[PDB]
Each structure stands twice: as structure tokens, then as C-alpha cells.
Amino acid sequence: DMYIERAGDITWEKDAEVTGNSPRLDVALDESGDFSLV
Amino acid sequence: TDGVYRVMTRSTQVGVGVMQEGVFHTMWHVTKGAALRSGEGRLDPYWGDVKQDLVSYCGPWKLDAAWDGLSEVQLLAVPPGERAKNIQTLPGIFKTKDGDIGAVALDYPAGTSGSPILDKCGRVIGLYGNGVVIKNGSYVSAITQGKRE
Numbered sequence: 001d002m003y004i005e006r007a008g009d010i011t012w013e014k015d016a017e018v019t020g021n022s023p024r025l026d027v028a029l030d031e032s033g034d035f036s037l038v
Numbered sequence: 039t040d041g042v043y044r045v046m047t048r049s050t051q052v053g054v055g056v057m058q059e060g061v062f063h064t065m066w067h068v069t070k071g072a073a074l075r076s077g078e079g080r081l082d083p084y085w086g087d088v089k090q091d092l093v094s095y096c097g098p099w100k101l102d103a104a105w106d107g108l109s110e111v112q113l114l115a116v117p118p119g120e121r122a123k124n125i126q127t128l129p130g131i132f133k134t135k136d137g138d139i140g141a142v143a144l145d146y147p148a149g150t151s152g153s154p155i156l157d158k159c160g161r162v163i164g165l166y167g168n169g170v171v172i173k174n175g176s177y178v179s180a181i182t183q184g185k186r187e
């Protein structure tokens with residue numbers, strides 16, 4: 001039994017917490033949908 | 039109705055998706071392309087692509103907004119057992135032989151897969167959860183978007 005349940009509205013939040021870097025990565029994508037690092 | 043939804047198996051949250059224009063959008067690895075229940079109703083898989091890791095239910099892919107390649111974005115993360123929260127970030131880039139894809143360096147549990155990534159207008163520019171693990175064990179997700187035909 002795989003089912004869905006509503007979890008909220010889709011809305012941009014003003015003045016939000018900002019985190020994470022902006023990595024520049026060389027990757028490959030295979031036919032099964034898997035990304036890998038080159 | 040339109041909104042963000044948890045995808046559950048009976049319970050465990052295995053992912054998240056977006057309802058827009060009567061179509062439910064999630065990542066293929068969340069459902070393996072199988073049918074879903076919504077209340078007493080059944081959602082049938084209509085379109086999908088394992089290489090993109092995407093699937094849509096009840097109709098074709100509807101999400102057509104694209105990352106502008108410049109601006110900060112928000113992950114509307116819906117982690118298992120936690121309410122939806124917005125996390126703003128400046129994407130990095132997956133550079134591939136077929137072009138660049140925006141990517142977010144944000145790390146959440148596996149069942150957060152399918153959470154939408156948003157532009158400043160609140161449009162869904164892609165779904166979170168298909169990515170790579172970098173050397174230190176942290177995670178980077180593509181901003182995975184389908185084609186609205």
C-alpha cells in the first residue's frame with residue numbers, strides 16, 4: 001500500500017535561512033538514472 | 039488538490055511529490071513507477087523516464103519552470119516526521135557531457151526525495167533527490183526537471 005498525504009502549500013519563504021555551498025562538479029549520468037563523479 | 043505531498047508505504051515515508059494541474063509529480067525511485075493511492079482513489083502512472091528519474095501520475099509532466107542559472111533557489115524540504123521547511127541556497131553545477139544542470143548542496147534523509155525546489159515566484163523548477171556523494175560524505179542533488187510537452 002503506497003499512498004500520498006498532503007503536507008503543505010508550495011510557497012517561497014521571504015527572508016529564509018540560506019545555507020550550502022555551490023559546488024562545481026564533473027558528473028556522468030547513466031541510462032538507469034544514476035549520477036556519478038568523473 | 040494542488041500542493042506538496044508525502045509518499046508513504048504501509049508506515050514509512052519513502053518520498054515526496056507535487057500535485058499541480060491534477061497531475062502528481064515525483065521521482066521514479068520513490069515509487070518505482072507503481073500506482074499510488076490518494077484517499078479512496080487510485081493514481082495511475084502516465085509518463086516517466088528512468089534516466090531522468092521522474093514519473094507523473096494521471097497525466098503528462100506539468101512542471102515547466104526552469105532555473106535561470108543565476109539566482110538563489112529554495113528547497114521546500116518535507117523530511118520524514120517533520121513539517122515542510124524552506125531552505126534557500128545558491129546552486130552549484132553538475133557539468134555533464136550533455137550540458138550543465140543546477141545542483142543543490144543540501145543533505146536530507148532519503149524519504150525527502152521528490153521535495154520541490156522553487157524559484158522566487160514559487161514555481162517548481164525541479165525535484166530534489168537524484169545526486170552524488172562527495173568526498174567528505176555530504177550530498178549534492180541535481181535540480182531535476184522534466185519536459186512539459
Ligand SMILES: N=C(N)NCC[C@@H]1NC(=O)Cc2cccc(c2)CNC(=O)CNC(=O)[C@H](NC(=N)N)CCCCNC(=O)[C@H](CCCCN)NC1=O
Nearest residue numbers: 033034035067146147148151167168169170171175176177
Ligand atoms: N550513483 C549512485 N548510487 N549515487 C547515489 C547518490 C545518492 N545515494 C546515496 O546518497 C546513498 C548513500 C551513500 C552513503 C551513505 C548513505 C547513503 C547513508 N545516508 C542515508 O541513509 C541518508 N542520506 C542519504 O541517503 C543521502 N545523503 C548522503 N550524505 N549520502 C541523501 C539522499 C537524498 C534523497 N535521495 C536519495 O535517497 C537517492 C536515491 C537513489 C537515486 C538513484 N538514481 N540517493 C542518492 O541520490
